[PDB]
Write a protein that binds this ligand. Structure first.
Ligand SMILES: Nc1ncnc2c1ncn2[C@@H]1O[C@H](COP(=O)(O)OP(=O)(O)NP(=O)(O)O)[C@@H](O)[C@H]1O
Ligand SMILES: Nc1ncnc2c1ncn2[C@@H]1O[C@H](COP(=O)(O)OP(=O)(O)NP(=O)(O)O)[C@@H](O)[C@H]1O
Lengths: 87, 253, 254, 253, 254
């Protein structure tokens, strides 16, 4: 529903990070699904941001594998970060 | 991006190491360099646009001459490279966590939370998750190389250089390094350079190979093509035959 | 044949010019760009770790001066001189020299080896490839930690030496204590002689550390090079200290 | 010479390197030892050579217990073997003449004239006739190593040991050393031991191979038999395959 | 945590036991006289190559003693005292210590580095299989060159120091040659002001070289260890010289 869209670069990582945290503060269960295909590709730190966001509510299975960009899922699989995140 | 080096000439210690080298590093491809030891392999990589200054010729990144053009761009441009130098360097005074984290601080200004997460992701990409608090000096040799590589790919660089990664090792490790290269060239859309003496491994990895000796390129091609052009030097070099343009010192009397 | 020497002399002097250039590049107070936590840490290796050696040396020198002074003074019949001579000897000539030579010396050698190792290992090359100028990370805090540490160690050395001197000169050998302390005041002073001892140690600290950094860092990567550099630092550090000690003492007390 | 090694056990300080190794070094044959890096390959040769004290082990030279030999028997026995060490072990303070000549003075009392002729013959047999009177430090890599070998064969020993001969990186050198081993093996009726790394080069030379890891023999056989009975450790080891009994740290939350 | 120190101390002391055993074997049995004809070569790198440093330092020390002696002695008896103090100081305390430490530096680290490499490259080890005992072939002539060389250097250091003292004390600063020379003869006895300088020199020569050989011939074949060995030979022989100097001078002139 609430999607932190656009390019996550190193330079603005801090603000994109806080925007997501604000979305989390307004927490739902099931956690809101984020379309990550609205993000610009080629940024591993985008994942670092996404991982930290999910980990703010680690007890919640807020997984949206369908909305993961192909480049993002390829780095996840290559790096053994693959988990059953299907929905 | 594409990297071009043209008419390179370099003299160190009053000797010429390189004489009019002309290279085309193809984007997204694996480019490899082979040759006799002690002939400039590390030097040539350093002259790609590192810290060495050529006497003649040009270095082009994206077609632009890196010499002079400009300070700020070059500082930022440097964030696009990662390397393993010879045995591979780790800083002894830093934990593994810090060795991987280190280059991040050269170009970014991040919260402790995000720098920590990037280190965790990069260590898992090479099978090192969970070794963050150990000092690097306590690692086995197979792990020292993997830690250094995690540093090299820490900034999402476009070019990874492996300086003689296959030179001397354990067959198990050779299997692992080969796999990491295959995994990463795809996962990160990388352009890579492998410079190595161990011809049998290079021949099955690279898309394109240059054979360099005595300061000159002595033949180029895909591995299939190099085998087709048996200049005595290249042919002996790529086969291991003891016969060819090599010397022994004798004369009977 | 003969030209061999000539080539050796020419290359060593060229190297000095390089060292001078390096010192100029490092000395500008640029390191403020990063944190100084690194400095505090570095001081651990150049200063704190060497206190044991300098302390033991100071005690033996003090006791030796005590016994030699005494066996001469008993032929003058004037024992008040133990105070005056133990103090002047240590403050003017020995603390600034013994401390400088034991310091670099040990710290000198170890520092040379450590920087040189970082060159040989390719660690320094990597830093430039990353973009962090090594002079602001590896060299800077090492040069300054050496500057602060030696002068401070010089003072401790003298302090131990004076105490060691009294311990034998007055307490085992029967000298009336009042003349010892009076002899020190008569006529060596805190505002003059102590000050000159410190000035000489600032000069020595710079010569010793500057050489140790240079010898480690500025060398093409020859595998036998580290051991040679370590020996070379000890030799040059030592002659520079003695050559300068002469010209400075010749002025301060001339 | 047949060398028996039985129930070998050896610790370096508290660490066990070997635990009941049983070897048969076959007369007139080339035997070889392969295994993972750092598992004591050199330690094993040193024990075979009698330079280390085995812990309750038995070592027999032509059936004779080395532990029971008199000073004269041991001294004479030294002239039965020569070895080429991993670094080349040349003496920097002596010219090539003395480096090859040197061991002759440990066992003989010869006129300078005959000593000089043997040096000339031995250098010729390895292509070093023209290096006479040069200091060894001025030799190129391949030449440097050949001199060291010339020393090992200087006394016409029965047994030659080569410690990591194929770890050389230069394909040209690999060619030459392979030929020298085969050439000398035949010319002097030698029994030889090759202890190395990079499998494409010991599997085509040895007549018989032991695979050693973690203080144990992991299998033995001719190159063909090792593949036939390649217990998974051996199989992946000789193949240089990934997914063998190789671990890395891993757990996630 | 704390037991760490415990283990460090225990092992370092075990090592001294080993050193004692090594010394015994090298000195105790040396029958191979035919090969000892080469120690004269070995001496080249211990004795011949070290005169430049000992000579230059001897001159600076002599000149410094001259200037400091003079500025104190103008209030007590320079006409008689420059002679007596310059010669007793150099014969009793400084030639045996300054030369001993400069030597420990220049010859000591170089020698330990050399044995170290002989071991690290495995070159030394290859001799065992040739039947040539490395202690009789490699170590013997090095230890002996050290014993002879330091004492001869010690004398030269003092000889230069006398030239230095006179050059400033008598020739630039206004003192009589007559009383300088006679004063020295009146107070300096061969028995035992010259002789004790030599005795202390022999003790230091043996102790200092013994350590350099021992540490170079290290247990652990790791490249990091060469630099460590070099630093340690300088530190240990340096403290040992000062410790033993104290006891010997205490006896000789007490
Ligand atoms: N900075 C330097 N200045 C002067 N001489 C150097 C320097 N660094 C190394 N040497 C020499 O310059 C060359 C260093 O690079 P290089 O030839 O590329 O090594 P390499 O081929 O990778 N070595 P190797 O891995 O053994 O084959 C060699 O010829 C060295 O003898
Ligand atoms: N006295 C000693 N004390 C402690 N370690 C020692 C000593 N002497 C030698 N070393 C040991 O010597 C061993 C030699 O075997 P190893 O480590 O397997 O090297 P290697 O055989 O050349 N390795 P590789 O080339 O892969 O076959 C090392 O593990 C060192 O610890």
């Amino acid at each position: 529903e609430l999607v932190v869209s656009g390019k996550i670069d190193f330079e603005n990582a801090e603000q994109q990070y806080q925007a997501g945290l604000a979305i989390i503060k307004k927490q739902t269960s099931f956690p809101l699904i984020v379309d990550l295909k609205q993000l610009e590709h080629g940024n591993t730190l985008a994942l670092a941001v996404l991982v930290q966001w999910l980990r703010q509510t680690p007890q919640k299975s807020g997984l949206h594998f369908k909305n993961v960009p192909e480049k993002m899922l390829k780095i996840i699989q290559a790096c053994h970060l693959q988990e059953d995140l299907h929905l | 991006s594409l990297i071009e080096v043209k008419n390179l000439s370099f003299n160190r210690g009053e000797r010429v190491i390189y004489d009019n080298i002309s290279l085309n590093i193809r984007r997204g491809q694996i480019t490899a360099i082979m040759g006799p030891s002690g002939t400039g392999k590390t030097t040539l990589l350093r002259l790609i646009g590192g810290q060495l200054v050529p006497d003649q010729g040009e270095v082009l990144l994206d077609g632009k001459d890196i010499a002079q053009m400009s300070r700020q761009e070059l500082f930022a441009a440097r964030a696009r490279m990662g390397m393993l130098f010879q045995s591979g360097a780790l800083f002894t005074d830093m934990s593994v966590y810090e060795n991987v984290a280190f280059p991040i601080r050269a170009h970014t200004k991040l919260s402790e939370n995000l720098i920590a997460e990037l280190v965790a992701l990069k260590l898992e990409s090479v099978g090192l998750r969970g070794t963050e608090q150990l000092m690097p000096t306590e690692l086995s040799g197979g792990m020292n190389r993997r830690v250094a590589l995690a540093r090299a790919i820490a900034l999402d660089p476009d070019l990874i250089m492996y300086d003689e990664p296959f030179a001397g090792q354990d067959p198990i490790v050779k299997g692992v390094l080969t796999r990491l290269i295959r995994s990463l060239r795809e996962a990160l859309d990388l352009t890579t350079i492998i410079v190595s003496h161990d011809v049998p491994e290079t021949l099955s990895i690279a898309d394109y190979i240059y054979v360099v000796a005595e300061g000159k390129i002595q033949g180029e091609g895909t591995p299939e093509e190099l085998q087709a052009y048996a200049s005595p030097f290249v042919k002996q070099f790529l086969t291991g035959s003891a016969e060819g343009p090599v010397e022994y010192q004798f004369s009977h009397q | 044949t003969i030209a061999w020497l000539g080539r050796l002399v020419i290359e060593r002097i060229r190297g000095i010019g390089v060292a001078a250039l390096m010192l100029l590049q490092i000395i500008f107070s640029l390191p403020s760009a990063g944190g100084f936590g690194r400095f505090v840490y570095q001081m651990h290796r150049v200063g704190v770790m060497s206190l044991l050696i300098i302390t033991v040396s100071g005690l033996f020198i003090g006791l030796v001066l005590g016994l030699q002074g005494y066996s001469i003074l008993v032929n003058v019949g004037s024992e008040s001189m133990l105070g005056t001579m133990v103090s002047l000897t240590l403050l003017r000539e020995l603390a600034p020299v013994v401390a400088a030579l034991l310091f670099a010396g040990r710290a000198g050698s170890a520092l040379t080896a450590e920087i040189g190792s970082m060159k040989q290992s390719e660690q320094l090359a990597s830093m430039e490839m990353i973009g962090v100028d090594p002079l602001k990370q590896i060299v800077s805090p090492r040069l300054w930690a050496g500057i602060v540490s030696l002068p401070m160690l010089t003072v401790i050395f003298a302090a131990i030496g004076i105490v060691g001197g009294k311990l034998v000169g007055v307490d085992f050998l029967g000298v009336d204590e009042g003349s010892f302390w009076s002899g020190m005041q008569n006529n060596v002073q805190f505002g003059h002689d102590v000050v000159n001892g410190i000035i000489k140690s600032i000069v020595f600290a710079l010569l010793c550390t500057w050489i140790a950094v240079f010898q480690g860092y500025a060398c093409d990567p020859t595998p036998e090079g580290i051991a040679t550099a370590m020996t070379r630092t000890v030799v040059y550090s030592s002659l520079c200290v003695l050559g300068f000690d002469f010209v400075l003492t010749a002025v301060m007390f001339g």
